[PDB]
Scaffold this motif. Sequence first.
Motif: not given
Lengths: 123, 108, 196
Positions: A53-61
């Motif tokens: 939420x602070x940034x836009x990083x994602x960890x998609x499987x």
Amino acid sequence: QVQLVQSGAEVKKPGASVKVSCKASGYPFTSYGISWVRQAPGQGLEWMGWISTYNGNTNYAQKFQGRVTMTTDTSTTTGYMELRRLRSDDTAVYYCARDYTRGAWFGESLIGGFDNWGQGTLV
Amino acid sequence: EIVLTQSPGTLSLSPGERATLSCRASQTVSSTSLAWYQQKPGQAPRLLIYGASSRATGIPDRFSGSGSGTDFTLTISRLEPEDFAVYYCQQHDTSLTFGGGTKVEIKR
Amino acid sequence: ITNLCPFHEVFNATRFASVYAWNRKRISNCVADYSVLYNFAPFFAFKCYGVSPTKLNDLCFTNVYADSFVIRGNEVSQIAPGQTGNIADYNYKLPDDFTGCVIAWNSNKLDSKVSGNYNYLYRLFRKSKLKPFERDISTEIYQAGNKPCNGVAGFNCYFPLQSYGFRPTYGVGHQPYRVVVLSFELLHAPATVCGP
Ligand SMILES: *[C@@H]1O[C@H](CO[C@@H]2O[C@@H](C)[C@@H](O)[C@@H](O)[C@@H]2O)[C@@H](O[C@@H]2O[C@H](CO)[C@@H](O[C@@H]3O[C@H](CO)[C@@H](O)[C@H](O)[C@@H]3O)[C@H](O)[C@H]2NC(C)=O)[C@H](O)[C@H]1NC(C)=O
């Protein structure tokens, strides 16, 4: 006291895209990430997405890599799936949870799990 | 990925008896990375244990955890018959993988 | 300023770095809540070198530096300004004008293997004493005596980083204590981190 709500049940045909909303209240929506998981009848859960939420990083499987993209609106403190490439028998309930496994700022592993869960949406 | 093995296929126990649940690991899982989840019929899962035996929400006197290294188990004592729920165990070291599950029945 | 400082990321963790190579975390714009530091989880003394925990919710600083590692219990007293030792000369240096706090707690259930833990390394022999707040990670052999070792690492040439060798069945003291040190700076600079 923490409240998680989502939209109503939806019906869709293959080839379209489904938009799913998850409103959160009761806690600061800045120091926790959002985990989006699938649950299909007759079997267990999955791990579609982790979003900060602070940034836009994602960890998609990697299983659903390249097909899932979701956003966060901090003005309303909401999570949005805009899931594309719908397929016929992918009908399952969807859960949004406040994650306590990966930090929203630096990203290292935490100790804990999913502590607050929404009501889930069905497509 | 890392997969988990559960072989409490079905527990045939009356209320108030000992309940043991197994979440055996495949190769290696860190001691300080685990989770457990209740699942009541027609509801959403909730967090129960987030480590060795640390409690998360309430846990009056029944839910306990133990294990070390690559094997882990959950213990329930004086099981009041309300729960009879499904049990999920989650690993944390490599990505994220839920367990298969386990059903708890009534033993009529 | 509506963000909340992620103190629940340093204390809440699973892969604390080793003493010979620690991690330095810098805190940015947020609002810090010190209640959970002392009101809850009082494992060991707050050990606040400057000011006091009771008055830590009114003043505020520019940036917060967090440094985390795991050490010996007997070495815990070595983590203080004005002291020197096997870890205060080559491993970790505390400036004499240090401001902030150090938090140590037992980590038996966390870092303990049946054979023991050996992934944590500490330097033993080095040419000189460390400058304050300096990292000296380096893979090299020590030249002891009059033999100019060219990488043989044989006699009179010992590898400075020594395996630690923890144990889950040994008495207290040698049991691992995890230490996180918090450093502050109060200066006439634009305020960035302030509590309620
Ligand atoms: C490191 O993590 C622990 C445990 O994390 C806790 O459990 C997770 C699954 C998540 O739900 C976390 O949000 C949650 O904090 C933290 O310790 C716990 O902190 C909370 C916050 O104050 C404590 O709650 C209090 O508990 C007392 C018990 O009498 C109540 O009376 C209070 O009203 C309040 O609810 C909790 O006791 C405490 N210990 C646990 C859960 O075992 C810890 O704070 C965290 N580290 C940091 C730096 O925050």
